[PDB]
């Protein structure tokens, strides 16, 4: 029973790797040899956001590149303004342990997650003037890890029990459930078209999920350790992944294998969060040895080094116009770099 | 630019109100001392503290508030989570201490408890956190030694060659055999904790019972030890 199944599975994975090795005509770095290098990129701390009490676990920009949500472990969710350093909202959370936060594309809602496996949506209309819990979602068994808004009606969440859901906010139930992963799903990265997404789990395998169909299309097994954060390329045809083995990797949805690997011998620390830039030439990586590396996505060389944090860079975001890059670390400071 | 001056005055007023609220919350946050309660499923870790003021239950976690000598304590019991714990433990680096509760009465589980204590102790983010150790169900160890065969000497060949430490003081009304077993468990955990030798955090061993009141005062005293050792480190005295 189990041995003919596992032998069939192994012959299928040998067919898949024969496919993947036939497809590999050449490498990206050979192609990109006659490409002008980026050079030294110097970015400076334009603003420093303060007033958080505990460590800043996750944060997410707005779609107008103006207001950022920051999420902390003290039980406070602070909606900031990036231009004038004004706290436009501060929300007290029910559970103190928070692991993710999401901001709606229209700006009407903020979502937060954490260890109490409940996604809490807060409305920002404030017809009375006070922020209130708009809804709570308690479907998942394991902890809630990263959650992102497709729109104001449907939110996609990544639990800790290897299951991703698609919630409808109006019904308050789970529309579509994704259960293909075996390791703990850490974060998800939505497509710019919002038809697909990718999830990186702890089993060193990124999956490509269709929201409407309800099943994975592709599996990527290029890493060696826990895939921490995942981010799409701005055209929606590629993604980058950061793991604990100090190697970033770039993957293709069409070639179904890794194009390039971003690795340096001097740094052996893990990779917390990666965001591309607007153009897609700079890959920004929040390393665990207290700084950010600006890798070149086409040349695999560090442009420059954002060593402004005192503790580990917990999360990294880039605005939709590419104007500034915000990093939150575990010293409770949010640096805006330009 | 008059309208933008009006908008900036309104945003500044909102920012002043929020900033004041955050200062009050900063005071309340700093007064609070966090404690992570970790233990295996065999052990009665819930039965450890009986001086709890309240026992509030969230969906996937349990929170306990108690105060000792006007000092507020939050104790977070991890509830319904997956068996793999290497990703949600990173949240708990900010706590003052980790209370670790182990059942001595069953012997097979003890080896797993020793591996879990090793993995706690050698973790990168749990280096700054002290760990406070409870060796629960000592009365059961007493009752279970008089069973014709010793399990611990089977599961551990070192315990055929072991003597009671001279620094250790046995309680009156006890069997030297039972105290040998107690201190040999204690020594296993202290050899795991001394093996690393970082000097940033220490391991406080305590022999507790099934029904006992003194546990909150013990955790208070070990908190005083942790913050005194932390300030001694901080002025580079030790």
């Amino acid at each position: 029973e189990l041995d003919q199944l596992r032998q069939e599975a192994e012959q299928l994975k040998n067919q898949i790797r024969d496919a993947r090795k036939a497809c590999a005509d050449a490498t990206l770095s050979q192609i990109t040899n006659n490409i002008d290098p980026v050079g030294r990129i110097q970015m400076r701390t334009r603003r420093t956001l303060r007033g958080h009490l505990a460590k800043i676990y996750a944060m997410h920009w707005g779609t107008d590149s103006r207001l950022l949500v920051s999420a902390s472990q003290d039980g406070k969710l602070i909606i900031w303004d990036s231009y004038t350093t004004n706290k436009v909202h501060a929300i007290p959370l029910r559970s103190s342990w928070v692991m993710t936060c999401a901001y709606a594309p229209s700006g009407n809602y903020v979502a937060c997650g954490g260890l109490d496996n409940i996604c809490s949506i807060y409305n920002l209309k404030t017809r009375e003037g006070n922020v209130r819990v708009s809804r709570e979602l308690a479907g998942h068994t394991g902890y809630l890890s990263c959650c992102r808004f497709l729109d104001d009606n449907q939110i996609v969440t990544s639990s800790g029990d290897t299951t991703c859901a698609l919630w409808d906010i109006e019904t308050g139930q789970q529309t579509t459930t994704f259960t293909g992963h075996t390791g703990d799903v850490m974060s998800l990265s939505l497509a710019p078209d919002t038809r697909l997404f990718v999830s990186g789990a702890c089993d060193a395998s990124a999956k490509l999920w269709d929201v409407r169909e309800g099943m994975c299309r592709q599996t990527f097994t290029g890493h060696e350790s826990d895939i921490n954060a995942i981010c799409f390329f701005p055209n929606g045809n590629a993604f980058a992944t950061g793991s604990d083995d100090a190697t970033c990797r770039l993957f293709d949805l069409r070639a179904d294998q890794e194009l390039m690997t971003y690795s340096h011998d001097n740094i052996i620390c893990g990779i917390t969060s990666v965001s591309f830039s607007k153009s897609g030439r700079l890959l920004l990586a929040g390393y665990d040895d207290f700084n950010c590396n600006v890798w070149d996505a086409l040349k695999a060389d560090r442009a420059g080094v954002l060593a402004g944090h005192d503790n580990r860079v917990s999360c990294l975001g880039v605005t939709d116009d590419g104007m500034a890059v915000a990093t939150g670390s575990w010293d409770s400071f949010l640096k805006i770099w330009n | 630019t008059e309208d933008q001056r009006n908008e900036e005055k309104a945003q500044r007023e909102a920012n002043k109100m929020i900033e004041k609220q955050l200062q009050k919350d900063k005071q309340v946050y700093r007064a609070t001392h966090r404690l992570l309660l970790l233990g295996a499923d065999n052990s009665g870790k819930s039965t450890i503290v009986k001086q709890m003021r309240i026992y509030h239950v969230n969906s996937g976690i349990f929170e306990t508030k108690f105060q000792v000598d006007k000092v507020n304590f939050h104790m977070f019991d991890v509830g319904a989570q997956r068996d793999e714990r290497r990703k949600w433990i990173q949240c708990f680096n900010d706590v003052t201490a980790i209370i670790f509760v182990v059942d001595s009465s069953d012997y097979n589980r003890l080896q797993e408890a020793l591996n879990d204590f090793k993995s706690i102790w050698n973790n990168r983010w749990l280096r700054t956190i002290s760990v406070i150790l409870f060796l629960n169900k000592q009365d059961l160890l007493a009752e279970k030694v008089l069973a014709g065969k010793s399990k611990i000497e089977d599961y551990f060949p070192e315990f055929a060659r072991y003597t009671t430490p001279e620094d250790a003081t046995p309680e009156p009304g006890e069997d030297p055999r039972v105290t040998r077993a107690k201190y040999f468990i204690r020594d296993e955990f202290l050899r795991i904790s001394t093996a690393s030798g970082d000097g940033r955090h220490y391991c406080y061993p305590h022999f507790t019972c099934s029904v006992d009141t003194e546990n909150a005062r013990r955790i208070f005293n070990d908190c005083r030890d942790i913050i005194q050792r932390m300030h001694l480190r901080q002025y580079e005295l030790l």
Epitope: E224, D244 | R86, E112
Partner: nanobody, 128 residues
Framework: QVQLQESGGGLVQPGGSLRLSCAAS????????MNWVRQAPGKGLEWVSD????????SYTGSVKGRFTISRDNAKNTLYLQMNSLKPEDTAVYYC?????????????????????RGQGTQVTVSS
């Protein structure tokens, strides 16, 4: 792709010898601490023994200590376990396990609910 392949095992006799070969494919072998983990019939997983990156530090489980040799070759990229003085009560499935992070000394791999850095394991039966 991280993949592990155990080899050797089977129906043996008490007091005999057996070598378990483990082949680690799909990663750099010298960076990771690695270890052996077994599963009795109708019981849970238990940590047999461990070995670090360089191979200097080696510890065992108490109740079978002094009975198993753990050799890692980095160049051959193989993990051997030498099993002499076998006992009929110690009949189980043996899984190679790998600690998930490189250059570290902390391991969380006793999980039974689909830990995905282990091999399929080998059945090792002792008949007296």
């Amino acid at each position: 792709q991280v993949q592990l392949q155990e080899s050797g095992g089977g129906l043996v006799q008490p007091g005999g010898s057996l070598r378990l070969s483990c082949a680690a494919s799909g990663f750099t072998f010298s960076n990771y601490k690695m270890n052996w983990v077994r599963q009795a019939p109708g019981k849970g997983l238990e940590w047999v023994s461990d070995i670090s990156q360089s191979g200097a530090s080696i510890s065992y489980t108490g109740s079978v200590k002094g009975r198993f040799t753990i050799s890692r070759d980095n160049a051959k990229n193989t993990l051997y376990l030498q099993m002499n003085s076998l006992k009929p009560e110690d009949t189980a499935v043996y899984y190679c396990a790998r600690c998930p992070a490189p250059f570290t000394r902390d391991c969380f791999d006793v999980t039974s609910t689909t830990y995905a850095y282990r091999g399929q394991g080998t059945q090792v039966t002792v008949s007296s």
